[model samples]
Target: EWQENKSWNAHFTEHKSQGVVVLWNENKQQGFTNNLKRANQAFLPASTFKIPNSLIALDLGVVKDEHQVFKWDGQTRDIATWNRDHNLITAMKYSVVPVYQEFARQIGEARMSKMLHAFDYGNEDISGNVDSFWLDGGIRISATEQISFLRKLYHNKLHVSERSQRIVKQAMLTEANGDYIIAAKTGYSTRIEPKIGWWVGWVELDDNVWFFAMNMDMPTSDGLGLRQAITKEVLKQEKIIP
Candidate 1:
């Protein structure tokens, strides 16, 4: 079942941004959406693809494990945090693009495509540059699809080893407090027209796992933070967090 909660509209409008939010309640098997139409519309996967990319890389033994270190290549990147060496968890936390791009190159197009199809990832089109398809090539995923994929990751049901899934999920962890823990990924498709920003993942609260996926048109970089701000507001209204 799906329900539309228009009140969440205010949060997006507040930032002068347009987007969709799909929140699925694991216990109820129900979904709440701010805009059902956009919820089904697909967009670039962007950095959010890192979740499955990590999974495929791990399963293929491209990288030994999450703790395996990736040394800096002595080249500076756009992000400061990526200037040093990083393991899977640190790379994910910083959203280090170069590290993941290297992983894509190593995983190769055929294997990456094979695993993406196996996971039933949206569109399943990894065409264009093998290393940048999810960023600027032909791959696209809807908000609804993001939740579906995330649900699989949350339940260790993806087409990868359970250990791989667990390690990737560990890297996805962004926030954790005594009350609740959030495992999410933020994505930005700056290469696309108008750009697109994403924040997709699940929240572990008490006995429930709340999965949410949101993507918004980012005409300018200033609106990027809204991806999480708007989602947090919706989660707050739902009493999913304090």
Candidate 2:
């Protein structure tokens, strides 16, 4: 649904091992990439799906708002912070798996399936298991679709209540530096061999917002950092951030 000037990438001997698609419109100065066939290839949404999951939870009245707290089950796990109670905002901030697992259980398979279709989300298949659908199987999405879905949320264009949109974005806000606010999420899928790392979300500037979705194979835990680093370097190179 766009055009471009070669791939906006310049790196990696393993460049072919990943896919990146950033779609932005800065005051009519828009970018549409043509050098991206993988951009349209679908992969497991992983935690990038959280953006839509948050919206769906709020839209279906799953919770009152981002403030609705899900108490920690009192079971300490690997990530220490998760042992404490968390609201939608905190859960999203930490990317707490348990918190969202509970939300998925409440949303249930039938309703979850129902909502995916309504949103036209991904491949609309939550097959594996309710709590782990987005983990590695069930739902899949291409980078192009991810950006499109992100724009929908950014512009209040999703088929959801305005309040849902606002709250979800509120939960997504990660950092604010100078005049820019970065709202993003990181996802790592360990179910696959090489593993998959995702960094998805947008940067809100004074007059416009720029959205990005980055995915790469993680041969080791170190690869997790690549998701954010790669996108950050590109942003700086493009003068989106300096």
Candidate 3:
């Protein structure tokens, strides 16, 4: 992975003027950076923000457990259609917005906002309401900030109780390869002038660990886009076979 990344860096440098920052860490060893500018600038989280929503729901007891089935409205209002009855784990895995939105409503804006702000989200705006313009209008987060947040979540340092953190972590886990686990969430936007894409997750490789949040600006009516490709590429390079 390291060697391929080095080669990619060399080839990618020709497009340096395009404003790109590729930051990555392998197995908790360290991080590599290229084009530090805009590294700290906030950008819309798109669907990646759902991870936090899932955590809030679990902590507040909005959803009983990963397997507690909830009925989904038959109408396809946005993004994807969800199962008529599904669990939190499947809802998240399918990235079903309606299911999550319903869960969010049950958790209520107040509780959701509390968790969102607890993680220091949307620093540029302090209203802290999940229904506030910043969150719905478009929440922004820097690449560095996103990675930092994930690290805190992984280490159980994000202010949530340990038990709540564990539940959230379990919801994020997805099989990568062998015994390795890769916990990930994908995000895309429909209202944004130009759609945004995201893939944020952590990979547990044996005893080592890696966390990443990749974002891209692209037009996506649905969930699939550049971020998915980037995630696959990252896994391939990292030898995360699955």
Candidate 4:
């Protein structure tokens, strides 16, 4: 198994409705939980869809790059940070919804449909509304599939231009310590009875990179942070980081 210790698994047991998938790119190995069954089932990506949405924009030349600034609308948002303008990095950091909705409309359904097939994204179903397909229950992707897509994104293996991959990776940088950098995106869907949360990212290293996707049904918002906490512990236990 790819996991060096079972401490990470404890998070899932504690939550009781979580699934995890961690992949070692250089080693070509993987470890997951019996939620393996649940891991195989896809859920709405919510904001985690930003990773691909960013890639699609860059690939389609919709935005110049990650630094392209998007002006904010005047409407007040529940989270004060989201009411103002945002670029790719800021939008992703805060999981800004409107910025990417604009992106989706600009990208258009036709192109999105074509690219989804090329990316082999989840069920490749870009149905429903163009702006809300991913959010409005149109597409579902399993934890395992998230890892496959992320692995390709991290390694420039996706068919899109390598520059797009590089640019997205740079924007995904959420934290750093010495030589290792962690690039990731988080998503939350609270529209239903039980909210769903996700933390998807990779640890960059000189020798290798480790990728992880963690998701769970949140009975309460308190468990959201556990996604990153558990993954980080697993990374440490595996000696991927100091």
- Using lDDT, give the best candidate's number: 1
Worst 10 residues of 4 by lDDT: 1-10
The most accurate candidate by TM-score is 1
TM per model?
0.97, 0.90, 0.78, 0.89
Model 1 lDDT per residue over 40-79, tens place: 9989999999998999999999989988999999998777
Q: Tally clashing residue pairs in candidate 2.
A: 1
Give the lDDT of residue 145 in candidate 1: 94
For candidate 1, what is the TM-score?
A: 0.97
Going through the candidates in the order shown, the clash numbers are 0, 1, 2, 0
Cα lDDT tens digits, model 3, 23-140, are 4564545654343544555766656666677777777787667778877677755444464566777776777766776776687766666777788765634244443333356467
State the lDDT at 103 in candidate 3.
Answer: 70
Q: Whole-model Cα lDDT per candidate?
A: 0.90, 0.77, 0.62, 0.79
Could you tell me the lDDT of residue 65 within candidate 1? 92
Give the Å shift of residue 189 in candidate 2. Answer: 1.4
Candidate 3 off by > 4 Å: 1-29, 78-80, 124-135, 221-225, 235-242
Ten contiguous residues minimizing lDDT sum, candidate 1: 218-227
Cα lDDT tens digits for candidate 2, 26-139: 456565543467667777877777888888788877888777778889888999888898898888877898888878888889988987887778899999889888996668
Question: Candidate 2 local accuracy as lDDT?
Answer: 0.77
Point out the worst 10-residue segment of candidate 2 by lDDT: 10-19
